[PDB]
Amino acid sequence: ETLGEKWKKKLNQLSRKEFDLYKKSGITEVDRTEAKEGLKRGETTHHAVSRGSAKLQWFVERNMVIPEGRVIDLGCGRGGWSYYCAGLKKVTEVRGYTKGGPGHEEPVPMSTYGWNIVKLMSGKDVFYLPPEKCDTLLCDIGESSPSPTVEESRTIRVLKMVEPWLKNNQFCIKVLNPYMPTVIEHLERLQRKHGGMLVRNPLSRNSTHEMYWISNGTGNIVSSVNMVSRLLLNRFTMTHRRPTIEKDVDLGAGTRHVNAEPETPNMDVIGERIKRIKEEHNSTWHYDDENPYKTWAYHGSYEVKATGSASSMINGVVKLLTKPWDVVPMVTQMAMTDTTPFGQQRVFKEKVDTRTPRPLPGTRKVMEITAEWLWRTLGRNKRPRLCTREEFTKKVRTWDSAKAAVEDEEFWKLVDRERELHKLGKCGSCVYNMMGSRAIWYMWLGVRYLEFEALGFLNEDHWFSRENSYSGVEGEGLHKLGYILRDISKIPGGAMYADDTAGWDTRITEDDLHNEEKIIQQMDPEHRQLANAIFKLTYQNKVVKVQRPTPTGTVMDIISRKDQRGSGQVGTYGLNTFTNMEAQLVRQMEGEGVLTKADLENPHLLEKKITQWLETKGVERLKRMAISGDDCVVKPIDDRFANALLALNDMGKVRKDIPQWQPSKGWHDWQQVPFCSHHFHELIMKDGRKLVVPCRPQDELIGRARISSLRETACLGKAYAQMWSLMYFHRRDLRLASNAICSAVPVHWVPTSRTTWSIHAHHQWMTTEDMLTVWNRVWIEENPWMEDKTPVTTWENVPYLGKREDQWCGSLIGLTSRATWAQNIPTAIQQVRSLIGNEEFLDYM
Numbered sequence: 001e002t003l004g005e006k007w008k009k010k011l012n013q014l015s016r017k018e019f020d021l022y023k024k025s026g027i028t029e030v031d032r033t034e035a036k037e038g039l040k041r042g043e044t045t046h047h048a049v050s051r052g053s054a055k056l057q058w059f060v061e062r063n064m065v066i067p068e069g070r071v072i073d074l075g076c077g078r079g080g081w082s083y084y085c086a087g088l089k090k091v092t093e094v095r096g097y098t099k100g101g102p103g104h105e106e107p108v109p110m111s112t113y114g115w116n117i118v119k120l121m122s123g124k125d126v127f128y129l130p131p132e133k134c135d136t137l138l139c140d141i142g143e144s145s146p147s148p149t150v151e152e153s154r155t156i157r158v159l160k161m162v163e164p165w166l167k168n169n170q171f172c173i174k175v176l177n178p179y180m181p182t183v184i185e186h187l188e189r190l191q192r193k194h195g196g197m198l199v200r201n202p203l204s205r206n207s208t209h210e211m212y213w214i215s216n217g218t219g220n221i222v223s224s225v226n227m228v229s230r231l232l233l234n235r236f237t238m239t240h241r242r243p244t245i246e247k248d249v250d251l252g253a254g255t256r257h258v259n260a261e262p263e264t265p266n267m268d269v270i271g272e273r274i275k276r277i278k279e280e281h282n283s284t285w286h287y288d289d290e291n292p293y294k295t296w297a298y299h300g301s302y303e304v305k306a307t308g309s310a311s312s313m314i315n316g317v318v319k320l321l322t323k324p325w326d327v328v329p330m331v332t333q334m335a336m337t338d339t340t341p342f343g344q345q346r347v348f349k350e351k352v353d354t355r356t357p358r359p360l361p362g363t364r365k366v367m368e369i370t371a372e373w374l375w376r377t378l379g380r381n382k383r384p385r386l387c388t389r390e391e392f393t394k395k396v397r398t399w400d401s402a403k404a405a406v407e408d409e410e411f412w413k414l415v416d417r418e419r420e421l422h423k424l425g426k427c428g429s430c431v432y433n434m435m436g437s438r439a440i441w442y443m444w445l446g447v448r449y450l451e452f453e454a455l456g457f458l459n460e461d462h463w464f465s466r467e468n469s470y471s472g473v474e475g476e477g478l479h480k481l482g483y484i485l486r487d488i489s490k491i492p493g494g495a496m497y498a499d500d501t502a503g504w505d506t507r508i509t510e511d512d513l514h515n516e517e518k519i520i521q522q523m524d525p526e527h528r529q530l531a532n533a534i535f536k537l538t539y540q541n542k543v544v545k546v547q548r549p550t551p552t553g554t555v556m557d558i559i560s561r562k563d564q565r566g567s568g569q570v571g572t573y574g575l576n577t578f579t580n581m582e583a584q585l586v587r588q589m590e591g592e593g594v595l596t597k598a599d600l601e602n603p604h605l606l607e608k609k610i611t612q613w614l615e616t617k618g619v620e621r622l623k624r625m626a627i628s629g630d631d632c633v634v635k636p637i638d639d640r641f642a643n644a645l646l647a648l649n650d651m652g653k654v655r656k657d658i659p660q661w662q663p664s665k666g667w668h669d670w671q672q673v674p675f676c677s678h679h680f681h682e683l684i685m686k687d688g689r690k691l692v693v694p695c696r697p698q699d700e701l702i703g704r705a706r707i708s709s710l711r712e713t714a715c716l717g718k719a720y721a722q723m724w725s726l727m728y729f730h731r732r733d734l735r736l737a738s739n740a741i742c743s744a745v746p747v748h749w750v751p752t753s754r755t756t757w758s759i760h761a762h763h764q765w766m767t768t769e770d771m772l773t774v775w776n777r778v779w780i781e782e783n784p785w786m787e788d789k790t791p792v793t794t795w796e797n798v799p800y801l802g803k804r805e806d807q808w809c810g811s812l813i814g815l816t817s818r819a820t821w822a823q824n825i826p827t828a829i830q831q832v833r834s835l836i837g838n839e840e841f842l843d844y845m
């Protein structure tokens, strides 16, 4: 009797209750919530049709099967394996066959990326089909049975059916029962002929001994099968472990043109950076022809140790003082952040490895005119300026590694050498990391300095301040954003629109880049030449480092791209604000009927009409906007803007979470308008004065504060408590939790570490000063929208949101557990105080 047979007898003896516990004990599982609701609403983009896409991805990620050419998918069902293959580098056609009909899954039609190369056929019994030529054979057929010999016949049947479909090609075949001796005998003969190996997918439930015969591998079937039997037997006795939750796959949207995908690198511009990386890592430098990059040019890899983690570190002090939130899913989903090479690669494939169609010639003309006008407007008072070593060094001080480098003369000597290459129109070492010795660290910081030197002026000199740019909100700060949205709401016209671009930085075109670059025209000759090196050699020819996991260990890939924004490069905020202002002006012109479909298609479009609209209405239309990077709030002259989608989608600025051609929905109540991850409420204090306050789902606030020595953990907790008291004092639970943290953390301990990296954060809470004096300075004294300067002497006079509004935005007020928490607060304070030690603490309400 095999171990698998012992496992089967035990599984069949389990009661219904203990079977439901065991089946998912310690397993990996994708969260199907979003996809199931999306499919229920009839959505055809992004969603995977079943858990199958995730299941196949696990194999593909690990190079166990690398689908390519003509893919055939036997028993495709709903199509999860097929729609996943459709977006892979080397796949040119996916033919899926499934039985369908009563008791069988039918193919679910979709518009995910590459749907156009997907051919799902129902009414196809694979056991009646003559084998076809194919480059990848996939098969996921096998119905379970309490009898293992019934499964044995089903498994041999599938094995005999698949075999003739194999001829030196890729495969991934389910083996329903691999533990029966005759199945092992059959697999051993199959491995001698076709190779491959048997692998267990962790996403498989414990109620099945299924394994997959994959083409890329070798190894001992008997040993691999028994290891699974042993794991599965051990899971019966093992104390119940909840499944490891992973984020489900994003299969994108739209048609795939395989010939449009590849990147053609400018080797004359990037060749030297590749040569130097190759030199520094010559001992492990290799060219991996099995790399997954479709739209990024690949140049080689080097071996590296793995960096990252599946989840975030939890803050113990704040968790202890926020007990009702242990049970809330959104709070724990915050900690769900996969930064492993597997996590990086998933994000790269779904978000970065895309190509935006060139905008039409009329769209390019409109953008060119708007850009020339906008830079002139932005440069009316200020002149561009070079930033310096002294400036960069000051900014760094206000990483310990960065402070060491800037104090080192060798770092500056390397910078000078690279600057001399930039002056000759050459780049030798300027690279950025998507996610991935001191020479490498110095080359990176030097790249960031040289970008800062040439383009730091846009941020440093406040080019996107509301005063300089009209639409900008730079230097404003969270507490001022709402007051600006309230002021914009006073402008008559349409609703306030707030459409987010799906991954903005990947939607930045070679045309956007050429328009952003136009600022060089206002620079002095020596500045012009340095900024022109950045734009041309580095921003329009990006050389990037990215980690990738392989069956033999982690590698660092060197990849390149001409278009898109370099997210790991300086000036991203300012360049995004500039292009978003321009794109929003173009969409306003279309909504006004100034810019037509005929204009967008016109190769010899006339500037006259656009120039008149900009010179006469431009600044007025800029004033109708609040633009902060990729994020915008637009209040147009009327609602035609909602239906104005031609120039927006043609520019490549496709809106997130909405079909391409569906009109936008806006708001007339400014307090419901989303902006920079927040919405803003207008409150009336006990004294009758009004306050405009920042707000967001309370679980996002708690969840974030719950992410990380003890002293550092307590100090970071205190920083979150003080930010809450200054910015989110109107949230009942946050003021109570803030008071609890400050009582539990030593009073003289000055908060350390940032609570956020937001450009809108001025960190007035990073102090030992009394929080009510800081509150008064922020909310009354320095507040330009507060006319009456009378201070507030008590927190009782610092207002809360209305009970219903506090509840709508996630408050737990009115729940029994929240009431128990409030009663149990002095106890939670004592527990943290006990752990910290015998220090000086104070009591807060």
Ligand SMILES: COc1cc(C)c(C(=O)NS(=O)(=O)c2cccc3cccnc23)cc1-c1ccc(C#CCO)s1
Residues within 6 Å of the ligand: 477, 478, 479, 676, 677, 678, 700, 704, 723, 727, 755, 756, 757, 758, 760, 761, 762, 763, 764
């Ligand atoms: C516009 O203001 C904010 C926006 C965001 C996004 C954050 C913020 O970090 N949020 S986060 O931690 O949960 C988060 C982290 C990383 C990525 C995210 C992506 C989307 C949404 N959140 C993300 C903080 C602030 C501020 C907090 C306090 C402020 C103040 C003041 C007055 O001086 S400003």
Ligand SMILES: Nc1ncnc2c1ncn2[C@@H]1O[C@H](CSCC[C@H](N)C(=O)O)[C@@H](O)[C@H]1O
Residues within 6 Å of the ligand: 049, 050, 051, 052, 053, 074, 075, 076, 077, 078, 079, 080, 081, 082, 097, 098, 099, 100, 103, 104, 105, 106, 124, 125, 126, 127, 140, 141, 142
């Ligand atoms: N004789 C047969 N011919 C064709 N398809 C069959 C079959 N016997 C079973 N099937 C189908 O095989 C499917 C297995 S489930 C397919 C899951 C899939 N890999 C995904 O990603 O969604 C079932 O839907 C079943 O209807």
Ligand SMILES: [Mg+2]
Residues within 6 Å of the ligand: 498, 499, 500, 631, 632, 674, 675, 676
């Ligand atoms: Mg927005």
Ligand SMILES: [Zn+2]
Residues within 6 Å of the ligand: 418, 422, 426, 427, 428, 429, 430
């Ligand atoms: Zn360089």
Ligand SMILES: [Zn+2]
Residues within 6 Å of the ligand: 679, 681, 695, 696, 805, 809
């Ligand atoms: Zn709110």
